[PDB]
């Protein structure tokens, strides 16, 4: 039988009997109200259940129903536009069906609707008797205008097709494929189920190559991320985190977005769930909602602690499911510190040894196993394809102390740090990225991509980072030397560093021409700024030895029009100017500055 | 003789908690025996007997306890402790952290089955290591010389180039060929690719054995991974007479897995929550190195460490330095200055250097030049620390000599680039050139008979 009975209750811990043959970390339903919990010990016919919800009013001799599964996700059509908690409860259906502002104890709405009918097309050259393997696409559901929801055979399933449905409209409970292996059948609907803590398998796991574009000049130029990459951001109040989330959501070369709240303040979660449905992007010359390619996992700080800890495992398992369709998925975790605190509470409730700063002994192993699921892959199964998951994960060091075990482990693992900074945000400098602390390690991997597609960019990035370092090195010296007595080469460095800092690194995302700065615009601007730097340096160095030498004042007096045209480059607009027009204008400034410097040489 | 009597199988699992499964009604339990578990879904897992008492045996399961149950799970007891099949075919193979192949080749045909735990070598039968290896890295060869048969770990931290240094050492090691046995615990796929790529790019791969446990693989494999690797090095060295270099990649992943295992048994904690016996445990790995009487072969160990928050007083680098014959120290402050290799000589040591160098071994000056370079570098650091308080105008010309030596030492002696392969003699003469800056009466580690022979060149 699937029923055992409650022997004893003490806090969230339930102990149940007749539980013989129940398995470690299975989920159960406890009591007449069917509270969820998981099995944490076995002893004889008894089990100990860690109940997730409130055990108040549970009684001895209550039923316990065993579910044959560990913690697992329903994966199938109806994920796009969904709101889930950390254990996949559909928060927007629970509200609609209950007509209540609360979440009931023991609510049991299924994660995906078994009510809606989905428009299904088979693979058209599959036939009865075909040989089929895990990851094989056997149909498509036309879920919305953006996502073809590819129906795939589960991993660990295989055989000979005994039946496949004709085209039509089906429930998530209708069997659409049947197959046989060793004379044993399997019947399959559109929805599969997968354990959150098991990595979804792939044919091969591949080096990351192509950039993830954000549309931001800083980020995309100075500190690039690859598709399949791993990134951290400092998650703190004044720093302006929303530019990352909105750039990824609206403008990135992702196909799909997964957003995870780990344990946020009630009112902070409400702003994300307010703003995300209202965002839009333009596709084939038509405006589309962001929620056609997006799903949200949401957890306020009073949701069950097991949901707070499961939250990132639900979000990555949902991401790995769309990777397997051959899409590129971006994942955002709202703070991984709020997850590590739930991990500390659970291990504290279990009375585990307090290791480092009260965190469990496995904290670093859990974070390494999480970020290890990022990457480009060659998918399982027959239609040859590649996909990827990229992780961005915020982290919240106490008072900026990076020696914190969670922050230290995170920055020990991730390959990019986008150091958003309150001290820059207070200057109205946007985006707030600290270009002295921020870094990317993917530059040896991206080399052969830039080399092929842009070619001149790698030298330009190198000189730009040097100018932005020399202007830090000069920042003390200028206070002693009094600006005027400085070398003309170094006055050129200071005031081209000002040009880069004010007109290249700043990008006002509310202005129509700079919402999204494409990479040809981004290299075009930097090419001209560094060309002017080289020419200004050459004009001084040609004459400084004994002539009536060139000075940075002479250059500003002789070329102030060109120096204004350079500050004017950011206003060029891909909505109204063609790529060829922007290229022609930036080439014309390069002719004009050559004619101006040749009139001084 | 062979185990000719048949194996017992049991459904008598009486309880499950943490990584531990507890059988009862077991016929004459054997401590440290291996057990094979078949789960209800037909998945196989393995575990080892961690305790016995009457009819009960306690098993730790290497792949974890998730999905095990008290009724359908079945355990087969092998009659024996953990042994690994070993042959000279294992060079040019890739294995996972439990010794199963991952290169699409076959399983090993054993030349023998060896106990994974090894066996302590008698101190009477040890030969003291005295043949210097030239790594060609000047910061190692000139100031921390490595004898063939030493234990000398690389103490590093997250983001530093300890992979690249360890690859350069494997690429350049020779006497003034090695077989390589390489173990990885808890590595990311880009680290696993880097080594496998470099060994194939240098053509060396037909003479390398790899054991890989990656960051997503089971944690409890990590505590047998270095014992599989060192058992392979002991066959190759002490039966097939080869010279073996053993690389153990991130021992901090081994120590973290050991803490996680021990925390579940509630054994007495030491500092920072590590097991009270961690010194002994690490010593059973690091003492599996050296030369022995009457056999040509040798094992050299170069374990790689990540220091948590760069703290050398943390139990992992601390208890390792108490056992190993020195350390090479990779410094974040040199790495941030774009120097390669980032080897800061002051926290670094080699103990076996003292007898592997000098007349007949290398050159007569080597023991004097090395000690004077340490003295001038320590004093140069003290003057640079004084300058930060009082400013340059306070410094006497004698302070400015040490502060000029400091700049030239880090550019000429330390900095090298990834494929440069200096002789010991280049390293020694690059040594004398920096020492030549100082008027000879300042060179107070060096006796008159050395100064009057080598300084005037």
Coordinates of C-alpha atoms in Angstrom, one line a residue, chain B:
Chain B
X1 CA 44.6 -18.4 -2.7
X2 CA 41.4 -17.3 -4.5
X3 CA 38.1 -16.6 -2.7
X4 CA 36.3 -19.8 -4.0
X5 CA 33.4 -19.8 -1.5
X6 CA 30.2 -17.9 -2.8
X7 CA 29.1 -14.3 -1.9
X8 CA 26.2 -13.6 0.4
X9 CA 23.5 -11.1 -0.6
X10 CA 21.2 -9.2 1.9
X11 CA 17.9 -7.3 1.9
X12 CA 18.4 -6.8 5.7
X13 CA 18.9 -2.9 5.5
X14 CA 17.7 -1.9 9.0
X15 CA 18.2 1.9 8.6
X16 CA 19.4 4.9 6.4
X17 CA 20.7 8.3 7.6
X18 CA 23.0 10.8 5.9
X19 CA 25.6 9.0 3.7
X20 CA 25.3 5.8 5.8
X21 CA 23.3 2.6 5.3
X22 CA 23.0 0.1 8.2
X23 CA 22.6 -3.7 7.6
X24 CA 21.7 -6.3 10.3
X25 CA 21.9 -10.1 10.4
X26 CA 25.3 -9.9 8.6
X27 CA 27.3 -13.2 8.7
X28 CA 30.7 -12.4 10.4
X29 CA 31.2 -8.7 9.2
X30 CA 34.7 -7.6 8.0
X31 CA 35.8 -4.1 8.7
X32 CA 36.7 -1.9 5.6
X33 CA 35.0 -4.6 3.3
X34 CA 33.4 -3.5 0.0
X35 CA 29.6 -3.9 -0.6
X36 CA 27.7 -3.5 -3.9
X37 CA 24.1 -2.1 -3.6
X38 CA 21.4 -2.6 -6.2
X39 CA 18.6 -0.1 -5.9
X40 CA 14.9 -0.7 -6.7
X41 CA 15.2 1.0 -10.1
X42 CA 18.2 -1.3 -10.9
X43 CA 20.9 1.4 -10.4
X44 CA 24.2 -0.1 -9.0
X45 CA 26.1 1.8 -6.3
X46 CA 29.1 0.8 -4.0
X47 CA 30.0 1.4 -0.4
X48 CA 32.6 0.4 2.2
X49 CA 32.0 -1.0 5.7
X50 CA 32.8 1.9 8.1
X51 CA 31.8 0.1 11.4
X52 CA 31.0 -3.5 12.6
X53 CA 29.3 -4.6 15.8
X54 CA 27.9 -8.1 16.3
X55 CA 25.3 -8.8 13.4
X56 CA 25.4 -5.1 12.2
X57 CA 27.6 -3.4 9.5
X58 CA 27.5 0.4 8.7
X59 CA 28.2 1.2 5.1
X60 CA 29.1 4.6 3.6
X61 CA 27.8 4.7 -0.1
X62 CA 30.2 6.5 -2.5
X63 CA 27.4 7.8 -4.9
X64 CA 25.2 8.9 -1.9
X65 CA 22.0 7.4 -0.3
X66 CA 19.2 9.2 -2.3
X67 CA 16.5 6.7 -3.5
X68 CA 17.7 3.8 -1.3
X69 CA 14.9 2.1 0.6
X70 CA 14.5 -0.4 3.5
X71 CA 12.7 -3.2 1.5
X72 CA 13.8 -3.6 -2.1
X73 CA 17.4 -2.4 -2.0
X74 CA 19.8 -5.4 -2.0
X75 CA 23.5 -5.5 -0.9
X76 CA 26.2 -8.0 -2.0
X77 CA 29.3 -8.4 0.2
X78 CA 32.5 -9.0 -1.8
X79 CA 34.5 -10.9 1.0
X80 CA 37.4 -8.4 0.7
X81 CA 38.8 -4.9 1.2
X82 CA 39.0 -2.3 -1.7
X83 CA 41.6 -3.4 -4.3
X84 CA 42.4 -1.9 -7.7
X85 CA 43.5 -3.9 -10.9
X86 CA 46.9 -2.5 -12.1
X87 CA 48.9 -3.0 -15.3
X88 CA 51.5 -1.1 -17.3
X89 CA 48.7 -0.7 -19.9
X90 CA 47.3 2.2 -17.7
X91 CA 49.7 4.7 -19.2
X92 CA 47.8 6.5 -22.0
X93 CA 44.3 5.8 -20.4
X94 CA 41.7 8.1 -18.9
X95 CA 39.6 7.0 -15.9
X96 CA 37.0 8.5 -13.6
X97 CA 37.5 9.1 -9.8
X98 CA 36.5 5.4 -9.0
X99 CA 38.9 4.0 -11.7
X100 CA 36.3 3.1 -14.4
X101 CA 37.4 3.9 -18.0
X102 CA 36.1 7.1 -19.8
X103 CA 38.3 7.0 -23.0
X104 CA 36.0 4.5 -24.7
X105 CA 38.7 1.8 -24.3
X106 CA 38.2 -1.5 -22.4
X107 CA 38.5 -2.3 -18.7
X108 CA 42.0 -3.1 -17.3
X109 CA 43.4 -6.7 -17.6
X110 CA 45.3 -6.8 -14.2
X111 CA 48.9 -7.8 -13.9
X112 CA 48.0 -7.6 -10.2
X113 CA 45.3 -6.5 -7.7
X114 CA 46.7 -4.0 -5.2
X115 CA 45.2 -2.8 -1.9
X116 CA 44.3 0.9 -2.5
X117 CA 45.5 1.9 1.0
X118 CA 49.1 1.0 0.2
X119 CA 51.4 -0.1 3.0
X120 CA 54.0 2.0 5.1
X121 CA 57.6 1.7 3.7
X122 CA 60.2 0.8 6.3
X123 CA 62.4 3.9 7.2
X124 CA 65.4 1.5 7.0
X125 CA 64.6 0.8 3.3
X126 CA 64.1 4.5 2.3
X127 CA 66.9 6.2 0.3
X128 CA 67.4 9.9 0.8
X129 CA 66.5 11.8 -2.4
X130 CA 69.6 13.8 -3.7
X131 CA 69.3 14.0 -7.6
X132 CA 68.1 17.5 -8.4
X133 CA 65.4 17.9 -11.0
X134 CA 65.9 21.0 -13.2
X135 CA 62.3 22.4 -13.8
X136 CA 64.0 25.3 -15.7
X137 CA 61.8 27.7 -13.6
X138 CA 64.4 30.0 -11.9
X139 CA 62.2 30.8 -8.8
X140 CA 62.1 27.0 -8.1
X141 CA 65.5 25.8 -9.4
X142 CA 67.7 28.6 -7.9
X143 CA 65.9 29.1 -4.5
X144 CA 63.7 26.0 -3.8
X145 CA 65.5 23.1 -5.7
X146 CA 63.5 19.9 -6.2
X147 CA 65.1 16.5 -5.5
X148 CA 63.9 13.4 -7.5
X149 CA 61.5 11.7 -4.9
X150 CA 60.4 14.8 -3.0
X151 CA 56.9 16.0 -1.9
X152 CA 56.6 19.7 -2.7
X153 CA 53.1 21.1 -3.1
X154 CA 52.0 24.3 -4.9
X155 CA 50.1 26.6 -2.5
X156 CA 47.9 28.8 -4.6
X157 CA 44.4 30.4 -4.5
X158 CA 41.4 30.8 -6.7
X159 CA 42.1 32.8 -9.9
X160 CA 45.9 32.3 -9.8
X161 CA 47.9 30.3 -12.5
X162 CA 48.8 27.1 -10.6
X163 CA 47.4 24.9 -13.4
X164 CA 49.8 26.7 -15.9
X165 CA 52.8 26.4 -13.5
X166 CA 52.0 22.7 -12.9
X167 CA 51.8 22.1 -16.7
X168 CA 55.1 24.0 -17.2
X169 CA 56.8 21.7 -14.6
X170 CA 55.4 18.6 -16.3
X171 CA 56.6 20.0 -19.7
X172 CA 60.1 20.9 -18.5
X173 CA 61.2 18.5 -15.7
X174 CA 64.5 16.6 -16.3
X175 CA 67.9 15.9 -14.5
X176 CA 70.6 18.6 -14.3
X177 CA 61.6 10.6 -19.1
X178 CA 59.0 10.9 -16.2
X179 CA 55.8 8.9 -16.4
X180 CA 53.0 11.2 -15.2
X181 CA 50.0 10.1 -13.0
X182 CA 47.5 12.8 -12.7
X183 CA 44.5 13.0 -10.3
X184 CA 41.8 15.6 -10.4
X185 CA 39.3 16.2 -7.5
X186 CA 36.3 18.6 -8.0
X187 CA 37.7 20.3 -11.2
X188 CA 35.5 22.3 -13.7
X189 CA 35.4 21.0 -17.3
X190 CA 37.7 23.9 -18.5
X191 CA 40.4 22.7 -16.0
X192 CA 39.9 19.1 -17.1
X193 CA 40.3 20.2 -20.8
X194 CA 43.4 22.3 -20.1
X195 CA 45.5 19.4 -18.8
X196 CA 44.3 16.8 -21.3
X197 CA 44.8 19.3 -24.2
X198 CA 48.3 20.3 -23.0
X199 CA 49.4 16.6 -22.6
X200 CA 48.1 15.8 -26.1
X201 CA 49.6 19.1 -27.6
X202 CA 53.1 18.2 -26.2
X203 CA 52.6 14.7 -27.8
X204 CA 53.1 13.2 -24.2
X205 CA 49.7 11.5 -23.8
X206 CA 50.9 7.9 -24.4
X207 CA 53.0 8.3 -21.2
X208 CA 50.3 10.0 -19.0
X209 CA 47.6 8.3 -16.8
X210 CA 44.5 10.5 -15.8
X211 CA 41.9 10.0 -13.1
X212 CA 39.1 12.6 -13.3
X213 CA 36.5 13.5 -10.7
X214 CA 34.8 16.7 -11.9
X215 CA 32.8 19.3 -9.8
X216 CA 29.5 17.4 -10.6
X217 CA 30.8 13.9 -9.8
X218 CA 30.2 12.2 -6.4
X219 CA 32.0 13.8 -3.4
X220 CA 33.0 10.5 -1.7
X221 CA 34.9 9.3 -4.8
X222 CA 37.3 12.2 -4.0
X223 CA 38.6 10.4 -0.9
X224 CA 39.6 7.3 -3.0
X225 CA 40.8 9.1 -6.1
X226 CA 44.3 10.0 -4.9
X227 CA 44.7 6.5 -3.4
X228 CA 43.9 4.9 -6.8
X229 CA 46.4 7.3 -8.4
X230 CA 49.2 6.6 -5.8
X231 CA 48.6 2.8 -6.0
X232 CA 49.3 3.1 -9.8
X233 CA 52.4 5.2 -9.1
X234 CA 53.7 2.6 -6.6
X235 CA 53.3 -0.3 -9.1
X236 CA 55.0 1.8 -11.9
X237 CA 57.8 3.0 -9.6
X238 CA 58.5 0.0 -7.3
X239 CA 57.7 -3.0 -9.5
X240 CA 58.2 -1.7 -13.1
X241 CA 61.2 0.5 -12.0
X242 CA 59.9 3.8 -13.7
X243 CA 60.4 7.4 -12.5
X244 CA 56.9 8.7 -11.7
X245 CA 55.7 12.3 -11.2
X246 CA 52.3 12.4 -9.4
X247 CA 50.1 15.4 -9.7
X248 CA 47.1 15.7 -7.2
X249 CA 44.8 18.6 -8.3
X250 CA 43.3 20.7 -5.6
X251 CA 43.8 18.8 -2.3
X252 CA 41.4 21.4 -0.8
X253 CA 38.6 19.5 -2.7
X254 CA 39.9 16.3 -1.0
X255 CA 40.0 17.9 2.5
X256 CA 36.5 19.5 1.9
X257 CA 35.0 16.0 1.0
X258 CA 36.8 14.5 4.0
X259 CA 35.2 17.2 6.3
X260 CA 31.7 16.5 4.8
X261 CA 32.1 12.7 5.3
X262 CA 33.4 13.0 8.9
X263 CA 30.7 15.6 9.9
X264 CA 28.1 12.8 9.2
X265 CA 29.8 10.4 11.6
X266 CA 30.2 13.2 14.3
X267 CA 33.9 12.4 14.9
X268 CA 35.9 15.0 17.0
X269 CA 36.4 18.3 15.1
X270 CA 39.8 20.0 14.8
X271 CA 40.4 23.7 13.8
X272 CA 37.8 25.2 11.4
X273 CA 35.6 22.0 11.6
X274 CA 38.0 19.6 9.8
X275 CA 38.3 16.0 11.2
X276 CA 40.5 15.6 14.3
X277 CA 42.6 13.1 12.3
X278 CA 43.1 15.2 9.1
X279 CA 46.9 15.4 9.7
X280 CA 47.2 11.5 9.7
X281 CA 44.9 11.2 6.7
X282 CA 46.8 13.7 4.5
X283 CA 50.0 12.0 5.7
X284 CA 48.9 8.6 4.4
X285 CA 48.8 10.3 0.9
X286 CA 51.9 12.5 1.0
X287 CA 54.2 9.8 2.6
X288 CA 53.6 7.7 -0.6
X289 CA 56.6 9.2 -2.3
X290 CA 60.4 8.8 -2.5
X291 CA 63.2 6.3 -3.5
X292 CA 63.8 2.8 -1.9
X293 CA 66.7 0.4 -1.5
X294 CA 67.7 -1.8 -4.5
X295 CA 65.0 -0.6 -6.9
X296 CA 65.7 2.0 -9.7
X297 CA 62.2 3.7 -9.7
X298 CA 61.0 6.7 -7.7
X299 CA 57.8 8.7 -6.9
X300 CA 57.8 12.5 -6.9
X301 CA 54.6 14.3 -5.6
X302 CA 53.4 17.8 -6.5
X303 CA 50.0 18.2 -4.9
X304 CA 48.2 21.5 -5.8
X305 CA 46.3 23.5 -3.1
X306 CA 43.8 26.3 -3.0
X307 CA 44.2 28.4 0.2
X308 CA 40.8 29.6 1.4
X309 CA 40.8 33.5 1.4
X310 CA 44.6 33.3 0.7
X311 CA 45.2 32.3 4.4
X312 CA 48.4 30.1 4.9
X313 CA 47.3 29.5 8.6
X314 CA 44.1 27.7 7.4
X315 CA 44.2 23.9 8.4
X316 CA 44.6 22.7 4.8
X317 CA 47.9 24.5 3.8
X318 CA 48.9 24.4 7.5
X319 CA 48.7 20.6 8.1
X320 CA 50.1 20.1 4.5
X321 CA 53.2 22.2 5.2
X322 CA 53.8 20.2 8.4
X323 CA 54.0 17.0 6.3
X324 CA 55.5 17.9 2.9
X325 CA 59.2 18.7 2.2
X326 CA 58.6 22.4 1.4
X327 CA 56.0 24.4 -0.7
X328 CA 56.0 26.6 -3.7
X329 CA 53.8 29.7 -3.0
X330 CA 51.9 31.5 -5.8
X331 CA 51.1 35.1 -4.8
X332 CA 48.1 37.2 -5.8
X333 CA 50.0 40.5 -5.5
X334 CA 52.6 39.3 -8.1
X335 CA 49.8 38.0 -10.3
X336 CA 48.0 41.3 -10.2
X337 CA 51.3 43.0 -11.3
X338 CA 51.2 40.7 -14.5
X339 CA 54.4 38.8 -13.5
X340 CA 54.7 35.1 -14.6
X341 CA 55.2 32.8 -12.7
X342 CA 53.8 34.6 -9.6
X343 CA 56.1 32.7 -7.2
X344 CA 56.8 34.8 -4.1
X345 CA 60.0 33.2 -2.7
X346 CA 59.6 34.3 1.0
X347 CA 56.8 31.9 2.1
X348 CA 58.2 29.1 -0.2
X349 CA 60.6 26.3 1.0
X350 CA 62.4 23.2 -0.2
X351 CA 63.9 20.9 2.6
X352 CA 65.7 18.4 0.3
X353 CA 67.5 21.3 -1.5
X354 CA 70.3 21.5 1.1
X355 CA 71.9 18.3 -0.1
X356 CA 70.9 18.2 -3.8
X357 CA 73.1 21.3 -4.6
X358 CA 76.7 22.5 -4.4
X359 CA 80.1 21.1 -5.6
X360 CA 79.7 18.1 -8.0
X361 CA 75.9 18.4 -7.7
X362 CA 75.4 21.8 -9.5
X363 CA 78.1 24.5 -8.8
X364 CA 80.1 25.5 -5.7
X365 CA 78.4 28.9 -5.3
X366 CA 74.8 27.6 -5.4
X367 CA 74.3 27.3 -1.6
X368 CA 75.8 30.8 -1.0
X369 CA 74.1 32.7 -3.8
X370 CA 70.7 31.3 -2.9
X371 CA 71.0 32.4 0.8
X372 CA 72.2 35.9 -0.2
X373 CA 69.3 36.4 -2.7
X374 CA 66.9 35.5 0.2
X375 CA 68.6 38.1 2.5
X376 CA 68.6 40.9 0.0
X377 CA 65.0 40.2 -1.0
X378 CA 63.8 40.2 2.6
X379 CA 65.7 43.5 3.3
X380 CA 64.3 45.0 0.0
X381 CA 60.8 44.2 1.2
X382 CA 61.6 45.9 4.6
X383 CA 62.8 49.1 2.8
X384 CA 59.8 49.1 0.5
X385 CA 57.6 48.9 3.7
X386 CA 59.6 51.8 5.3
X387 CA 59.2 54.0 2.2
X388 CA 55.4 53.7 2.5
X389 CA 55.6 55.5 5.9
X390 CA 58.5 58.0 5.5
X391 CA 58.7 58.7 1.7
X392 CA 61.8 58.6 -0.6
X393 CA 63.6 61.6 0.8
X394 CA 64.2 59.7 4.1
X395 CA 66.0 56.8 2.4
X396 CA 69.8 56.6 2.5
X397 CA 71.7 55.4 -0.7
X398 CA 72.1 51.9 1.0
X399 CA 68.3 51.7 1.3
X400 CA 68.1 52.6 -2.4
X401 CA 70.5 49.8 -3.4
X402 CA 68.1 47.2 -1.8
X403 CA 65.1 48.9 -3.4
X404 CA 66.9 48.7 -6.9
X405 CA 67.8 45.0 -6.3
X406 CA 64.1 44.4 -5.5
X407 CA 62.9 45.8 -8.9
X408 CA 65.6 44.0 -11.0
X409 CA 65.1 40.6 -9.1
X410 CA 61.3 40.5 -9.9
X411 CA 61.9 41.4 -13.6
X412 CA 65.1 39.2 -14.3
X413 CA 65.1 36.3 -11.8
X414 CA 61.4 35.7 -11.1
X415 CA 59.7 36.8 -14.4
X416 CA 60.2 34.2 -17.1
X417 CA 57.2 33.5 -19.5
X418 CA 55.4 30.2 -20.1
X419 CA 57.9 28.2 -22.4
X420 CA 61.3 29.6 -21.3
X421 CA 63.5 26.8 -19.9
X422 CA 66.6 28.2 -18.1
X423 CA 69.5 26.0 -17.0
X424 CA 70.6 26.0 -13.4
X425 CA 73.7 27.7 -14.6
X426 CA 71.7 30.5 -16.3
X427 CA 69.7 30.9 -13.0
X428 CA 73.0 31.1 -10.9
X429 CA 74.6 33.7 -13.2
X430 CA 71.4 35.7 -13.3
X431 CA 71.7 35.4 -9.5
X432 CA 75.3 36.9 -9.4
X433 CA 74.4 39.8 -11.7
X434 CA 71.7 41.1 -9.3
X435 CA 74.0 40.5 -6.3
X436 CA 76.8 42.4 -8.2
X437 CA 74.8 45.7 -7.6
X438 CA 75.9 45.7 -4.0
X439 CA 79.5 46.6 -2.9
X440 CA 81.0 43.2 -1.9
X441 CA 81.4 44.0 1.9
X442 CA 77.5 44.1 2.1
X443 CA 77.2 40.4 0.9
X444 CA 77.4 39.0 4.6
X445 CA 75.9 35.5 3.9
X446 CA 78.8 34.8 1.4
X447 CA 82.4 33.9 2.6
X448 CA 85.5 35.6 1.2
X449 CA 86.6 32.4 -0.8
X450 CA 83.3 32.4 -2.8
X451 CA 83.2 36.3 -3.3
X452 CA 86.8 36.4 -4.6
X453 CA 86.1 33.7 -7.2
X454 CA 82.7 34.7 -8.7
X455 CA 81.9 38.4 -8.0
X456 CA 84.7 40.0 -10.2
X457 CA 83.3 38.5 -13.5

